[PDB]
Amino acid sequence: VYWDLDIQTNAVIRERAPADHLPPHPEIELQRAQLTTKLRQHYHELCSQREGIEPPRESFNRWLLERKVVDKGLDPLLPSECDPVISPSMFREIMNDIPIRLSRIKYKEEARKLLFKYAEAAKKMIDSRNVTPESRKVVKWNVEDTMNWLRRDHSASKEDYMDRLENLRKQCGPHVASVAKDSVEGICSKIYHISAEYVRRIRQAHLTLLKECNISVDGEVQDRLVYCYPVRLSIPAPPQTRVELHFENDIACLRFKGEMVKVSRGHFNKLELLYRYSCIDDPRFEKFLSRVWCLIKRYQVMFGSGSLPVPVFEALNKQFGVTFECFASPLNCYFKQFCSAFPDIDGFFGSRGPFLSFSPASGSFEANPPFCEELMDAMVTHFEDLLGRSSEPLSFIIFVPEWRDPPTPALTRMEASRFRRHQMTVPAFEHEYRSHGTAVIFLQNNAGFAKWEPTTERIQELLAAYK
């Protein structure tokens, strides 16, 4: 099986006012998709025109995640009100690819060609851009030195070329960085400001749509602890629109005005159950296909086009009482209760909203965050705040990459946390099909430690499931 939606929550929260998100509609989701495509195209053009490189692979997606750590703006996907304006994530990634991206190397000839390509690009940079005399002579020295060695008869393995390249990059990098720093900062700021303008246009289109539906957007003390429940929207949803569904080779194909999105039949059936469990404004499923269309399109837009193995979730539930994923989507969730990036659309399918906004007083949780350093670091701060704030049983079992060279602040801080009860590293070789190692950290307050202690037997059962 791929999920266990029968497991009830043990997450406990203060009851919530309904959220103010504008209710989703395919016409708006399509516009957001089109503008996000244009934004990616602007990013490509800025990287090419200003630095002669392709956008670092997956950097835009990580930018979306880092921006949402600080974004106070009105769009569920795109950023528009962020301090600082310049993303440290996008800045870091672009700078690492200047003057060229270091590709993956398999052959010694490709290692030799990359060494040459770096030296040549560094020289082109020094000859054509504003650079201090000191930085110019250092880069020039190192480049001509590499060129003279390459032009000679030499002896090197691919490892020797790569180390030669690493040493040349070591010598040139600080100087190349100082040359490009202001230009790269300008790419980061410009793409943010274009995004904010797109957010404004999407917002105006969405408000106009609601007004056309005669739906008002202008619409109490919360003093009880309740078991968690999906995010509810205060604004009435607009009427369903025409979305056509048919199946092709066990793929659900959903068409809105000629725009097709696809999801596997298994995921479609899962979404139908999640909706039955999570949606309270649509008893005859009239809005269901509209919302599935928005959901699929939203997640396709987010990424541009893995989860723990099921036996691990089973063992987390049986051995440590886990009922809830801090990082998930309706498509990948194992439990019917989870946090996700997009409560405006995911709440209908069980989302409790984004994790940094989620405030559990109690519960046993799993957390497998996106590979985003800034989100991971904010996650840890949030863990420590929650664990210190409540005396009810609270446990987080956290899976992050073994980033050691260099370390990432989230892992370093979790290893120094006063709430750490156990830690281990797990290599994994069995990966599920869908038709080095992982650091596992147990953070628990005293009550959670008493209730879900990482004893030897429980850890052994968890490791037995983690192949």
Ligand SMILES: C[n+]1cn([C@@H]2O[C@H](COP(=O)(O)OP(=O)(O)O)[C@@H](O)[C@H]2O)c2nc(N)[nH]c(=O)c21
């Ligand atoms: C391997 N690695 C990747 N990252 C983060 O992931 C981003 C993308 O790194 P990448 O090398 O472009 O791709 P990869 O993650 O698939 O290897 C980086 O800019 C970092 O934010 C890493 N961050 C830290 N601190 N340490 C690491 O060893 C490390």
Ligand SMILES: Nc1ncnc2c1ncn2[C@@H]1O[C@H](CSCC[C@H](N)C(=O)O)[C@@H](O)[C@H]1O
């Ligand atoms: N702010 C946020 N809050 C909660 N989840 C988020 C988030 N930002 C991104 N995510 C989601 O985090 C998930 C990480 S993949 C996690 C897979 C699976 N639920 C597991 O626990 O193993 C993705 O679905 C991603 O969309």
